[PDB]
Design a binder for this molecule. Sequence first.
Ligand SMILES: *[C@@H]1O[C@H](CO)[C@@H](O[C@@H]2O[C@H](CO)[C@@H](O)[C@H](O)[C@H]2NC(C)=O)[C@H](O)[C@H]1NC(C)=O
Ligand SMILES: *[C@@H]1O[C@H](CO[C@@H]2O[C@@H](C)[C@@H](O)[C@@H](O)[C@@H]2O)[C@@H](O)[C@H](O)[C@H]1NC(C)=O
Ligand SMILES: CC(C)CCCS(=O)(=O)C[C@H]1NC[C@@H](O)[C@H](O)[C@H]1O
Length: 492
Amino acid sequence: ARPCIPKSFGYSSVVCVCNATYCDSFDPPTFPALGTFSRYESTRSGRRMELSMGPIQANHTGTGLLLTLQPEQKFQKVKGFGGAMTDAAALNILALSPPAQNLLLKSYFSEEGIGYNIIRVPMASCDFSIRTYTYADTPDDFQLHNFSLPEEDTKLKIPLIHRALQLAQRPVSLLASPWTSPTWLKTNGAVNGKGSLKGQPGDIYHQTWARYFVKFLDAYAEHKLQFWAVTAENEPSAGLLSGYPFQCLGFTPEHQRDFIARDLGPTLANSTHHNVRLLMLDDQRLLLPHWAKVVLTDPEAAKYVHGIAVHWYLDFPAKATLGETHRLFPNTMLFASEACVFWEQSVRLGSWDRGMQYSHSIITNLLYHVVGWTDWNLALNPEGGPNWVRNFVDSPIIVDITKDTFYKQPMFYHLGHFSKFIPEGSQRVGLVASQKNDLDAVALMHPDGSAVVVVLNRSSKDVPLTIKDPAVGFLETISPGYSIHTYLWHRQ
Ligand SMILES: *[C@@H]1O[C@H](CO)[C@@H](O[C@@H]2O[C@H](CO)[C@@H](O)[C@H](O)[C@H]2NC(C)=O)[C@H](O)[C@H]1NC(C)=O
Ligand SMILES: *[C@@H]1O[C@H](CO[C@@H]2O[C@@H](C)[C@@H](O)[C@@H](O)[C@@H]2O)[C@@H](O)[C@H](O)[C@H]1NC(C)=O
Ligand SMILES: CC(C)CCCS(=O)(=O)C[C@H]1NC[C@@H](O)[C@H](O)[C@H]1O
């Protein structure tokens, strides 16, 4: 309905300006007939998911590269895509006028937007908060009688989660992850630094921490929010590093294996939230497949673990990490739970490179059995904050409080090229390249049988392209240099 208002900030591409009265949006999706495809195109030159249509032809005449859909070769099914509503994301969204807040929320979650369906909710504070806190800071409260949600949850996060669910056409899945426990349950008595849980799995300390998970789900159930899954600990390897700055909690793979078997697993099972999934690792895929062997070999731990959560930092091979983990444990899903972008500035408004970084990593993960991808902060300020430590990073939406204006980065549209067109339940199918190429392509099949194919060109040269669907025909197109396309078409 409304196109992108571009602004350049000196980098390789533009941002899309939005405010209280204007933001770019989509019309409700339509169903083009058989023999017709839909194409969404974003380019470094300024095009932003521009819709166009064309024919799927009976035969093909050309000398160029050919991609052939192979629908009979079926792989993993997709859980969904989204981001994390941290304290920082909530503070930056709510700093806008209410009309602008809704245009930001509609951008992510509405079908007028890119249709997110996963929100990662941190349990208490992390580095993207403006203060250290947990839900049970008063010490020696082992039954957790003084467990309570602060204003960060009751005033900021939960209301915004509600409004995002109202605007979403698709069911949204909430995913919780803890950063640190109460300090009186840790070895070093600090919110950060090198330290684990006091004692050994099964004692008063590990039991108290396991029910902290239940008391968290209780508090959100009271606010009428149910969770799809929780992770055992956000980056538990970080809590083993000497002098770690953010909130953390140390777990060796054997420690996480025992804490799941003796405490977290049974406690969540004996509770009203027994249907909530438990994901392990929630760390860099570097620690794979070793972390999967330690945990999933113990049947008393593996009986409770529904999947493995991966972070995308420390990636700069996938077949040795994601692929080998799948080969050893093919029935334990892999899920990208966090992602975000040394000499470079924290925020690079309009960076087309960081957009490509998102889409390429999404394509790689999809090609190696990952069932979903989650972004980090939903929104940040032009300095990459607020962050109480220092860790400023980038975000697909940057908020300018002083001008009631937020910018949609190229990262936003690169993820949207997946999140908007690959609904929960889609299955990845084969896509054969006729010859070596510079493109990254992934083919999936909607639950309704239709096809979806994302093609990203990280090279500077235009690549002529043909997509073959054996049931339909030949799709003639061109993938321009520095562009990403999403193709959709019905198969009958
Ligand atoms: C919010 O964004 C919209 C979109 O750019 C702004 O509306 C434009 O205003 C300029 C005036 O400087 C007109 O020339 C454009 O034609 C308008 N675009 C439209 C109507 O689509 C709006 O001004 C912005 N808000 C503020 C306070 O500046
Ligand atoms: C697509 O084309 C095939 C080859 O067509 C023949 O060769 C080309 C070079 C032209 O000379 C053309 O006039 C010839 O008929 C066809 O045999 C094939 O049937 C066509 N496929 C479909 C689905 O129509
Ligand atoms: C300062 C650290 C020593 C950098 C390395 C570890 S890290 O995991 O890459 C940080 C990322 N993941 C954890 C999030 O809380 C954090 O905000 C995000 O930037």
